[PDB]
């Protein structure tokens, strides 16, 4: 319990996420206090919308806290993949958020819900201000497991701004909002696609994109080593963000210098950025 | 285009997933013809079929391990899909409680429950070998679908609460999908395989007992697809140790434990 707040104060992004979580929790309380009246029709709707938002930012914060934990027997590599999992889950959150706002625009076009005194209009201004303060705060551009937490919540807040200006466009129109909903859903899905593609690449044990170009040259260099007959079962994959793990098997001469070949292979693949490397050396029979 | 159906016909799991995709696509046309959640359900088993299709593709330079993690990703995305389906069903139950046309009395839901019964009769189950995860996902999905079917005729029972029944079904299917998401998160986080974890201290003590092995370190084991375990290991051995014999014995020891892909790096100590 108490150590979590000692962990929440260790990291800048962690304290920012905690402040954001407290802010939407306060928003949830005040919005509930507004919806206990008879105007609950859209109040409960954007209430479960922001509730999802809170679940998204809670998942991001939980991943940020967990990612610094030490290794154990169960988790050999640590908890550094929580960052990638958070990015993936946040992208999925935004996809279903696009679908939900599509349904919202559809029902706004079809059924007239106008039993209200535009309380949500001023509340929408508060939500847009919250999105703006978030976009100002969260502007960004073995170890090192932090590259993907920022992008997911930043993309989520970009969506939240688009959901916020959707109702502004609706108010402009009434003096069509389904068209604005279509536009914002398509735009945030287009923005989401790179994050989902990168997370899918990492989580499918794919050769790192920053490593794939240099690997033919590395294989050629290791082949040129004295006494190396063949080079087989090459697997490179991304752990967290900047950590590349490589596994390699070498077939060498019956009397080759395994010490020198091992050191040179480690040097060759360390120069390419592979931090963790396993070189199995097999002495060929004649 | 044409080769996709041939791949579908080749796999038996992909064989059910194609016609089961056909039944709701027909059920969508019937529902649309009546109208003049479910399309989400069409997406979920579409990912289940796509994972079964993508999974047996050949390895290349970019995907060194193949495409066998698509199955774990599909189980993960089905779990997340069912979590969100439960939350939206909770919301829909709230709307039902707060706020009737009765065309056909929604008796089509009974034949829908029959379709889910057919699915649960059919999808009942209990490098290579890449199929364990899609079946569990479709099974707990169709179980959630049967519970959603029971929701409506529970409402019919009461009107002669459906929000309470929605609460019950959402909680129950979340409990049902908790183990699948737990296993998928374990696999996707490079956790040591739970079936292999108990055998690993024994294997460490067996490899340490090999003649000329000094230290054993940087042991990393993780799950690829479902039954394929990948292990990496580093050994410090004597300056004149039999590296061929040590490598063969280490490979035998960890192969007996269930590791299919193993990389043992042997370092020769300086005295």
């Amino acid at each position, epitope marked *: 319990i108490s150590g979590w707040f000692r962990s929440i104060l260790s990291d800048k992004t962690s304290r920012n996420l905690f402040f954001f979580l407290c802010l939407n929790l306060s928003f949830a309380f005040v919005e509930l206090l507004y919806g206990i009246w008879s105007n609950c029709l859209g109040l409960i709707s954007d209430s479960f919308h922001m509730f999802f938002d809170s679940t998204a930012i809670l998942a991001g914060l939980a991943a940020s806290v967990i990612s610094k934990w030490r290794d154990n027997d169960a988790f050999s590599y640590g908890y550094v993949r929580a960052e990638v999992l958070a990015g993936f889950v946040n992208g999925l959150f935004l996809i279903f958020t696009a679908f939900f706002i599509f349904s919202e625009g559809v029902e706004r076009a079809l059924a007239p819900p106008d039993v209200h005194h535009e309380r949500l209009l001023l509340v929408s201004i508060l939500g847009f201000v919250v999105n703006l303060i978030g976009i100002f705060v969260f502007k960004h551009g073995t170890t090192g497991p932090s590259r993907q937490i920022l992008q997911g919540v930043f993309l989520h807040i970009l969506a939240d701004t688009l959901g916020s200006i959707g109702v502004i466009a609706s108010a402009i129109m009434m003096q069509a909002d389904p068209i604005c909903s279509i536009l914002i859903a398509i735009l945030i899905v287009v923005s989401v696609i790179p994050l989902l593609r990168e997370s899918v690449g990492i989580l499918m044990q794919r050769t790192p994109p920053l490593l794939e170009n240099s690997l033919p040259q590395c294989y050629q260099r290791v082949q*040129q080593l004295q006494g190396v*007959y063949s080079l087989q079962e090459q697997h490179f994959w991304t752990l967290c963000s900047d950590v590349y793990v490589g596994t390699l098997k070498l077939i060498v001469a019956p009397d*080759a210098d395994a010490r020198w070949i091992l050191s040179q292979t480690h040097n060759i693949f360390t120069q390419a950025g592979v931090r963790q490397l396993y070189v199995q050396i097999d002495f060929a029979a004649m | 285009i044409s080769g996709w159906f041939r791949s579908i016909l080749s796999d038996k799991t992909s064989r059910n997933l194609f016609f089961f995709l056909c039944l709701n696509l027909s059920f969508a046309f019937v529902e649309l013809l009546y109208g003049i959640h479910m399309f989400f359900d069409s997406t979920a088993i579409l990912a289940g079929l796509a994972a079964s299709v993508i999974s047996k593709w050949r390895d290349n330079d970019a995907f060194s391990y193949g495409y066998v993690r698509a199955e774990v990703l599909a189980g993960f995305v089905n779990g997340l899909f069912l979590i969100f389906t439960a939350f939206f069903i909770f919301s829909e139950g709230v709307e039902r409680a707060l706020a009737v046309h009765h065309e056909r009395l929604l008796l089509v839901s009974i034949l829908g429950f029959v379709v889910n019964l057919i699915g649960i009769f059919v999808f009942k189950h209990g490098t290579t070998g890449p199929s364990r995860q899609i079946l569990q996902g479709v099974f707990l999905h169709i179980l959630a679908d049967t519970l959603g079917s029971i929701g409506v005729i529970a409402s019919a029972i009461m009107m002669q609460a459906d929000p309470i029944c929605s609460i019950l079904i959402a909680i129950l299917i979340v409990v049902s999908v908790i183990p699948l998401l737990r296993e998928s998160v374990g696999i996707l986080m490079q956790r040591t395989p739970p079936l292999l974890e108990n055998s690993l201290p024994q294997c460490y003590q067996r490899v340490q007992q090999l003649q000329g092995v000094y230290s054993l370190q940087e042991q990393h084991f993780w799950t690829l697809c479902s039954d394929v375990y990948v292990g990496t290991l580093k050994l410090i051995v004597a300056p004149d140790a039999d590296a061929r014999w040590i490598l063969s014995q280490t490979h035998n020891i960890f192969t007996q434990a269930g590791v299919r892909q193993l990389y043992v790096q042997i370092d020769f100590a300086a005295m």
Partner: antibody
Amino acid sequence: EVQLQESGPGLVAPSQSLSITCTVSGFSLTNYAVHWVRQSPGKGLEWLGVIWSNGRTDYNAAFISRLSISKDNSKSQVFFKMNSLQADDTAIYYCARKLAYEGAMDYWGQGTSVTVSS
Amino acid sequence: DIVLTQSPASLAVSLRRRATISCRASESVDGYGHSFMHWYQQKSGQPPKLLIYRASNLESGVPARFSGSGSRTDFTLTIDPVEADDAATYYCQQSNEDPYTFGSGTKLEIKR
């Protein structure tokens, strides 16, 4: 009783080829590498190349264009061929067995003096 | 190429004394705790004889009076005590980078 004997022409006129055969005894060429090293007063010791058990050969970077080393396991002979001789290559050529699992040469042969003159 | 410079070019030492030959490498010949520097002895009119492999290990069958030490770029070959048979030229050879390069030999002279 590891033996390395070399038989080559003492006199080779410039801009022709030199052929040295290294006959080995006491060990097999199917599990040992044989290095080629020449020694001349002007250039001290120089490393020519190595032939491995499976036939893979690694040469010196300067001599890659004009060097060729062959092997045959059956009669246990390593053939050394070097083309386009000048006065520089006047040196005592050795064939040496590679120290197993290390980068040194443990057992050498009685070097044959090769003289390049007209 | 890694050049190897030996100092001194010639060394004069008396019997039952201590003789030190140093080899200097332009680039480090060390990798992962091992230094791939080797010491050869070439007497009068025979091919060189291996003494030290990897800069610290005595070749099997050579006298224990020979010693090797050093790392990175500095290496030292020590003969203690020095006999009359040790009048030879000593070379240092690196095997950390292709092509294999030797050093200019150092001649040991037995003072009497």
